[PDB]
Amino acid sequence: MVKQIESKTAFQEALDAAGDKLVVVDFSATWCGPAKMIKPFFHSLSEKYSNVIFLEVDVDDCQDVASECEVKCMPTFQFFKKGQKVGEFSGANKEKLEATINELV
Amino acid sequence: MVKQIESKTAFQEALDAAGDKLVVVDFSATWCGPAKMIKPFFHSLSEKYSNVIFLEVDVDDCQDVASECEVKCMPTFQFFKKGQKVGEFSGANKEKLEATINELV
Amino acid sequence: IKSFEVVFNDPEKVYGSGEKVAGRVIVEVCEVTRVKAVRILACGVAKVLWMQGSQQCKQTSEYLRYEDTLLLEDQPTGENEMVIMRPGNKYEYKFGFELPQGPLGTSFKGKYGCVDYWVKAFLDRPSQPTQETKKNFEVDLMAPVSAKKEKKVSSMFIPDGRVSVSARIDRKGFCEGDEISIHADFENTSSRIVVPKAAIVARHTYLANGQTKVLTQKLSSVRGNHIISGTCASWRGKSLRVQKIRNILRVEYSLLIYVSVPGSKKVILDLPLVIGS
Amino acid sequence: KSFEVVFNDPEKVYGSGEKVAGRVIVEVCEVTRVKAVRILACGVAKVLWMQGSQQCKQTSEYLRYEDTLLLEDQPTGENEMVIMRPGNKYEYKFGFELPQGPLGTSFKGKYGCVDYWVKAFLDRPSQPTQETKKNFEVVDLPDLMAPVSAKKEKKVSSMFIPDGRVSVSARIDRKGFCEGDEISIHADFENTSSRIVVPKAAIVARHTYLANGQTKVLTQKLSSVRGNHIISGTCASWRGKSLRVQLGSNILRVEYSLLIYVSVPGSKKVILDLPLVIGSR
């Protein structure tokens, strides 16, 4: 399951919430065709990989975290272990996303 | 009657074969309304003043008589005696015509 | 001089784009007059103006510049022979000109602008100052502008690939020196990498060689990050400067927001501006 | 590869005023960078003849129209550059109107011709400017050396001469003169009106030129004569009264008339207007 997210302090939280567990973040957007298409696939993967923490951030809602994280486009996905990014890619590609998820757990 | 001058020669002969008599010359053109208008009158006069000699000159037929006499427009009337000009005026004017005649016989 | 007037054939007419204005200048004098010429100028000038916060901001744009020297019908000789005018008769000079099709620039004949047409005729007389007679004739904006465009950009594996651009700015009217601030969303579900761009362009309509010409100048411009297939990106306050520029009737201005697409035609928004000083 | 001027109505004969429109159509077999696509469109007449040993020529421009073409995909305009791959047709649109007046009227006959055409220049990478030219036909809606002549009559009435009239007719030998020759005028004038009238003649020139942004016309009385006062109730004639013929490169053409008119005091002039061609040595 995927925690919607609305503040940088709410963001800090999850970075704690997950222990040693890798955490994937969809920086998404409402009006974006490709991010809308990938949302569902992002949701099911959260059902599968419950050893992993999924989160969403709306780039328009959190202009601030989007920037703290140099996000340029949507969907962009970023991966952390311990708190520090280890993965990240852009584009609505399910396969790449599972592939990266696995390939980083 | 009016005598038709056909040339510089005819002209000279007219002038000298005249006597002491008064010669009147209507410098004329066949396309000129005013010259056309006064022709019959010139002619009635010739029949009346049978002691005056009446010539006509076509300025188109004899431009040479015309320019030697310095005719500039038509009808122009010139008046002679012993080869020599004693009168002149221009324009289709019966009254003026009869006056000069009686004034210069 | 007894009377010098410009009179149109339909004195009650208000005129339209591409249409023909005609009539005459009529002159009567008390005493005889040597006249050196009668000449006409016809103009159209819209003038758009406003106060930013509380500042003097204004653009002027012409739509007619027409001049001719007029000629009495019974006076065929030419402009290097003066005419003798006399009491009694009433001397009549025809003129005829025909407006340009396209705008006459009423557009913001509103709270913000206004539009001046008229005809001056001039009487030139030896050792005199030319006399003149002037006769008129007839023929939001601080609201936000926003626009959108989509273009199918297909692929064997993405036969429904699209590219779009949706754009917004604060108003149509800007002072030299300002920043135009841009809000824009770009989508790219096509197989190409695409690049979004913007430029302010200047279209000078100018008088040259019997004409009738417009030249396009590119002023400030920016370029965004390339956008890979299956993504979107955004401008949020990304800003373009309005620079001063250095026989032209007017300059029309536009903001162009376009996404350039390799192998295909641009997807172009053209957003009209008004730009004053 | 292909570089072709293509009119929308390939068969039209254009009339004065109409507007001429088409496309310049550019096709390529390998990738090219284009600095500009331009056009110039002209219309010009040359009247040309021998006057004995010596040639006399008048040249008239009816249409001097230049311009740079923009493609729809060039929205940043023309100090910007284009990129031409094979396989699609590049179409540059162009238009203009024919001037108002009388146009030379497409000819290739005894004393010369009149051609209108459109020229398309192209400018590749680092190359000189290639060319294509295509004619179009034009039509305005008497032999140069035949005699020209006219007559006119006006009622100049009088309370005492109601049928008062002034009339003139004149003839000249040809219509074409070289600068320097004289025009020998044959004219007959009749005046049955109550005024004294004065016959006059004059060469008048209309210079058509480009001031901005227009085609203007400057008119100039260029040489004239004055006959004798013709008094009421008379006629008079010119027998070859003779009359000599003697701004910038915005000067397109000049048109000439011999005016032979009569002045009637307190009434309109009576005017014959005989057109002329006037060439130089």
Task: Count the neighbouring beta carbons within 10 Å of the beta carbon of residue C229.
Answer: 18
Which residues pair with residue D31 across a beta bridge? Answer: none
Q: Is the dihedral of CA B24, B30, B33, B36 positive or negative?
A: positive
- Computed over its alpha carbons, how large is the radius of gyration of chain B? 12
Closest listed residue to residue C70, CA positions, set C15, C109, C120:
C120
Interface present between D and C (3 or more CB pairs within 8 Å)? yes
Which backbone phi and psi does A13 adopt, to 5 degrees? -40, -65
Mutate to test the interface with D, among C165, C212, C248 (most CBs of D within 10 A): C212
Please enumerate in sequence order all residues whose Cβ is within 8 A of that of A85, keeping only pairs 6 or more positions apart, or say none.
A78, A79
Q: Which residues of D touch C81 (CB under 8 A)?
A: 221
For residue B29, the SS3 value is coil
**DSSP H or E stretch at residue C64:** strand C56-70
Q: Which tokens in the block code for residue C141? A: 């904006």
Q: Which tokens in the block code for residue C257? A: 């927001």
C-alpha A45, offset from chain centre: 12
Q: Where are the domains of chain A?
A: 1-105
Amino acid at C206: Y
CA distance B99 to B101: 5
CA distance readout (Å), C275 to C108, C201, C242, D259, D268: 13, 11, 8, 54, 55
Any B CB within 8 A of D194 CB:
no
For residue A63, the SS3 value is helix
Which backbone phi and psi does C42 adopt, to 5 degrees? -120, 130
Q: Is the dihedral of CA D99, D102, D106, D108 positive or negative?
A: negative
Q: Which residues of D touch C216 (CB under 8 A)?
A: 70, 76-78
For residue C155, the SS3 value is coil
Say what the resolution is, in angstroms. Answer: 2.7
Please enumerate in sequence order all residues whose Cβ is within 8 A of that of D72, keeping only pairs 6 or more positions apart, or say none.
C265
β pairing state of A53-58 and A2-3: parallel
C-alpha C45, offset from chain centre: 9
CA distance C25 to C19: 20
Mutate to test the interface with A, among C158, C231, C235 (most CBs of A within 10 A): C231
Amino acid at A32: C
Domains of chain D: 1-141 (2.60.40.640), 142-281 (2.60.40.640)
> In this structure, are residues D158 and D184 in contact, taking their beta carbons and an 8 Å threshold?
no
Chains that touch C (3 or more CB pairs under 8 A): A, D
For C27-56, b/e burial (b = at least 16 CB within 10 A) is: bbbeeebebbebbbbbebbbbbbbeeeeee
CA distance D26 to D122: 9
For residue C234, the SS3 value is strand
Give B78: exposed, middle or buried? Use CB within 10 Å, 0-12, 13-18, 19+.
buried
Q: Which tokens in the block code for residue D82? A: 């284009």
For C172-190, b/e burial (b = at least 16 CB within 10 A) is: bbbbeebebebbbbbbbbb
> In this structure, are residues B47 and B1 in contact, taking their beta carbons and an 8 Å threshold?
yes
Closest listed residue to residue D111, CA positions, set D139, D143, D149:
D143
Cα nearest neighbour of A75 on chain C: C231
For residue A18, the SS3 value is coil
Q: Do D221 and C80 touch (CB under 8 A)?
A: yes
> In this structure, are residues C105 and C61 in contact, taking their beta carbons and an 8 Å threshold?
yes
Architecture of domain B1-105: 3-Layer(aba) Sandwich (3.40)
Q: Which residues of D touch B32 (CB under 8 A)?
A: 190, 234-235
> In this structure, are residues D180 and D246 in contact, taking their beta carbons and an 8 Å threshold?
yes
Q: Is B44 left (phi over 0), alpha (psi -120 to 50) or beta?
A: alpha
> In this structure, are residues C142 and C110 in contact, taking their beta carbons and an 8 Å threshold?
no
CA distance B74 to D113: 47
> In this structure, are residues D64 and C210 in contact, taking their beta carbons and an 8 Å threshold?
yes
β pairing state of D148-155 and D130-139: unpaired
Please enumerate in sequence order all residues whose Cβ is within 8 A of that of D249, keeping only pairs 6 or more positions apart, or say none.
none
DSSP tag of C81: S
- How many contacts does A have with C, using Cβ atoms within 8 A? 43
Closest listed residue to residue C184, CA positions, set C131, C245, C238, C141:
C238
Q: Is the dihedral of CA C75, D224, D190, B91 positive or negative?
A: positive
Structural method? X-ray
Q: What is the 3-state secondary structure (H, E, C) of chain D?
A: CEEEEEECCCCCEEECCCEEEEEEEEECCCCEEECEEEEEEEEEEEEEEEECCEEEEEEEEEEEEEEEECCCCCCCCCCCCEEECCCCCEEEEEEEECCCCCCCCCEEECCEEEEEEEEEEEECCCCCCEEEEEEEEEECCCCCCCCEEEEEEEECCCCCCCCCEEEEEEEECCCEEEECEEEEEEEEEEECCCCCEEEEEEEEEEEEEEECCEEEEEEEEEEEEECCCECCCEEEEEEEEEEECCCCCCEEEEEEEEEEEEECCCCCCEEEEEEEEEEEC
Alpha helices in B7-93 (DSSP H): 8-17, 33-48, 63-68
CA distance D103 to A94: 71
Q: Which tokens in the block code for residue C234? A: 């955004």
Q: Is C59 left (phi over 0), alpha (psi -120 to 50) or beta?
A: beta
CA distance A54 to A43: 9
